[PDB]
């Protein structure tokens, strides 16, 4: 992360779509290096389905400029996650802040 920033680092990283934000709020159930499984809260659960959101992270992949794309999870086991929270850092993000 930059020590001296500008406040606009958190809006570039979330809106670039290179992270993995949470669609629905809930509690993390199982974290791997490649898969995040979050159990959705009961008030945000639509009354038909089991209510489990599963995120699969893109591992070491070539970009257009022959660089590396690699998503790493930044949540731990069994902690609450709200809507819009950052679950997986992108290539050049750090807890959802742009880190060039």
């Amino acid at each position: 992360k930059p020590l001296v920033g500008t406040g606009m680092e958190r809006a570039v990283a979330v809106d670039s779509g290179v992270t993995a934000v949470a669609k629905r709020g809930g509690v993390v159930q199982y974290v791997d290096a490649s898969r995040i499984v979050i159990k959705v809260n009961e008030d945000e659960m639509y009354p038909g389905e089991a209510g489990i959101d599963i995120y699969n992270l893109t591992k070491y992949t070539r970009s257009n400029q022959n660089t590396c794309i690699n998503q790493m999870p930044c949540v731990s086991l069994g902690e609450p996650v709200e809507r819009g929270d950052v679950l997986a850092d992108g290539p050049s993000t750090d807890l959802g802040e742009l880190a060039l």
Binding site: V31, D32, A33, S34, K59, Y60, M72, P73, S76, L77
Partner: protein, 256 residues
Amino acid sequence: TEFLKPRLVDIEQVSSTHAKVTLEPLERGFGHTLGNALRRILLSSMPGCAVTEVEIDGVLHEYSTKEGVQEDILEILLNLKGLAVRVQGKDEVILTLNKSGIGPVTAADITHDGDVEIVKPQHVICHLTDENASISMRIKVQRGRGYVPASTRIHSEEDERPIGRLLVDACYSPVERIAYNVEAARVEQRTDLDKLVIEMETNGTIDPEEAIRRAATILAEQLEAFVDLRDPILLRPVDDLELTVRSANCLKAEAI
């Protein structure tokens, strides 16, 4: 002449990694000469142990993953650089780590040898998150000095290592930080004498008295170039003589 010799007087241990060493008495101008010369030798020319090759089972390269392990293998291989291991007897040990169950894998899970002493036994290596997941690795600790990257190691050694031996860059040097000051110590006639308080921050693996004793031996021996030193025709095969073919059935029959 009117010179004087120093002496080691006080070794104050602040922590398991921080130390202070006093050297007294020094004459005028000899505090900065022995102070700055021993700062450059201790930062570059001290031995220590470091992880060189790691071999995890079920893993081919460092860009892969593992089921249940939270960190990538490029993050496990960079945690093993900071492993502080003091090897007493040998020059190269091979450790083994085995751990099953949900929880952080630390340095207190390595099956210990009798002469291998791990300095920081709470150094986090990995994090297991699944119950059925189990990690298993054989960590090779060597001994050298300086800093040797792994790209030197493939270019030097042409031997075929098997696929699955991940190499780590080795930073053997134990010293992390050193500063010094030159104060004045009280001597009743010679009021113009000095002292030298050498701070020393490191990992474990090195007694702070053994470091200055070894730094002042590398310096004393590099001044040895300053004080005292100012029938070929025998083994050839038989067909290089243009002999007769009637002898070619004769010489080979006796196994000549």
